[PDB]
Write an enzyme that holds these catalytic residues in place. Structure first.
Site, short mmCIF file in Angstrom:
data_model
loop_
_atom_site.label_atom_id
_atom_site.label_comp_id
_atom_site.label_asym_id
_atom_site.label_seq_id
_atom_site.Cartn_x
_atom_site.Cartn_y
_atom_site.Cartn_z
N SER A 1 35.98 46.51 -16.13
CA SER A 1 35.96 47.03 -17.51
C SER A 1 37.01 46.40 -18.41
CB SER A 1 36.16 48.54 -17.55
OG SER A 1 34.92 49.22 -17.43
N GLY A 2 36.62 46.14 -19.65
CA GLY A 2 37.54 45.54 -20.60
C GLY A 2 37.57 44.02 -20.54
N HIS B 1 37.67 52.64 -23.34
CA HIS B 1 37.85 53.54 -22.21
C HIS B 1 38.96 53.06 -21.28
CE1 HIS B 1 34.90 50.86 -20.16
NE2 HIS B 1 35.52 51.25 -19.06
N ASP C 1 32.88 50.80 -27.87
CA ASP C 1 33.82 50.70 -26.75
C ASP C 1 34.66 49.43 -26.83
OD1 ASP C 1 35.10 51.34 -24.37
OD2 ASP C 1 33.43 50.78 -23.08
N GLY D 1 36.64 48.20 -12.14
CA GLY D 1 37.81 47.33 -12.13
C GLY D 1 37.61 46.14 -13.06
#
Ligand SMILES: [Ca+2]
Ligand SMILES: [Ca+2]
Ligand code: NA
Lengths: 223, 58
Positions: free
Chosen positions: A177-178, A40, A84, A175
């Site tokens: 995420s990932g 995402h 994801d 902020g």
């Protein structure tokens, strides 16, 4: 990161920032040319920022390298967030030393209760907004699949896992995420989603990296 | 039918910090907000121009 602490300049050498005119996601460096992040987090014009601490100021240890490729998992579902995971190739190989280093992929999945390190430049408030200049860190345990499913009925797949504290107050947030969830020196998770941030009975949900090791290695090798 | 331009901005469950635009009917202008990356509602635009074209005058 809500309820965490200041990591310290370059204490998490594998943590990178994904920038598209501003910081929008985190990522983990797995080798000099590849970064693991969330599907995402796919966005146009990504620039990977390595060696960062204060993301708003040039401190002298930064490496800004554009993404040459962004491969989202072929089975990624944008509705359920299943699979994801995304692999980003750096246009030019990053210079690894102590401040910019890769994190090892897992050989096996982590058990419930295992304490891990979660990091990022995301919101530090559960209610409201406050984005940090420097990298934030959080120690949190892997939670059982049963507790994760109870917290999020009909939303947890075999490729997701919960981590955090059920009483609330400590969690990853917008902020982050990932970004990484590292346990015993291995990348076990990718910050993915949750019901708000640091809410009681609503621990953070993360992509289960141990399920994609073979795909990661083969995909990197074929690009 | 309900005007999607009048719905409050929706961040969503994902944890990215993506800046998007939403039409703020109270203020009469397209404003910025934080989108998490997934399950976007329709009052969520990539630019002020897209927002004004779709929701201007709502
Ligand atoms: Ca900096
Ligand atoms: Ca605004
Ligand atoms: Na610093």
């Amino acid at each position: 990161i809500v309820g965490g602490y200041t990591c310290g300049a370059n204490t998490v050498p594998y943590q990178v920032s994904l920038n598209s005119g501003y910081h929008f996601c985190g990522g983990s460096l797995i080798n000099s040319q590849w970064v693991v992040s969330a599907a995402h987090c796919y966005k146009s014009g990504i620039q990977v920022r390595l060696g960062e601490d204060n993301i708003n100021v040039v401190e002298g240890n930064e490496q800004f390298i554009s993404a040459s490729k962004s491969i989202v998992h072929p089975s990624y579902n944008s509705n359920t967030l299943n699979n994801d995971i995304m692999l980003i190739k750096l246009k030019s190989a990053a210079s690894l030393x102590s401040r910019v280093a890769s994190i090892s992929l897992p050989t096996s999945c982590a058990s419930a209760g295992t304490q891990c390190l979660i990091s990022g430049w995301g919101n530090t408030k559960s209610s409201g907004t406050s984005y940090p200049d420097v990298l934030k860190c959080l120690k949190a345990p892997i939670l059982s699949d049963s507790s994760c499913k109870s917290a999020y009925p009909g939303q947890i797949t075999s490729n997701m896992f919960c981590a955090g504290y059920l009483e609330g107050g400590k969690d990853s947030c917008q902020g982050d995420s990932g970004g990484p969830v590292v346990c015993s020196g291995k990348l076990q998770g990718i910050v993915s989603w949750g019901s708000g941030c640091a809410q009681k009975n609503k621990p953070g949900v993360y992509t289960k990296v141990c399920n994609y090791v073979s795909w990661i290695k083969q995909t990197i090798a074929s690009n | 039918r309900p005007d999607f331009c009048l719905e409050p901005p929706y961040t969503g469950p994902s944890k990215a910090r993506i800046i998007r635009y939403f039409y703020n009917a109270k203020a009469g202008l397209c404003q910025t907000f934080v989108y998490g990356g997934c399950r976007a509602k329709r009052n969520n635009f990539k630019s002020a121009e897209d927002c004004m074209r779709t929701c201007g005058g709502a």
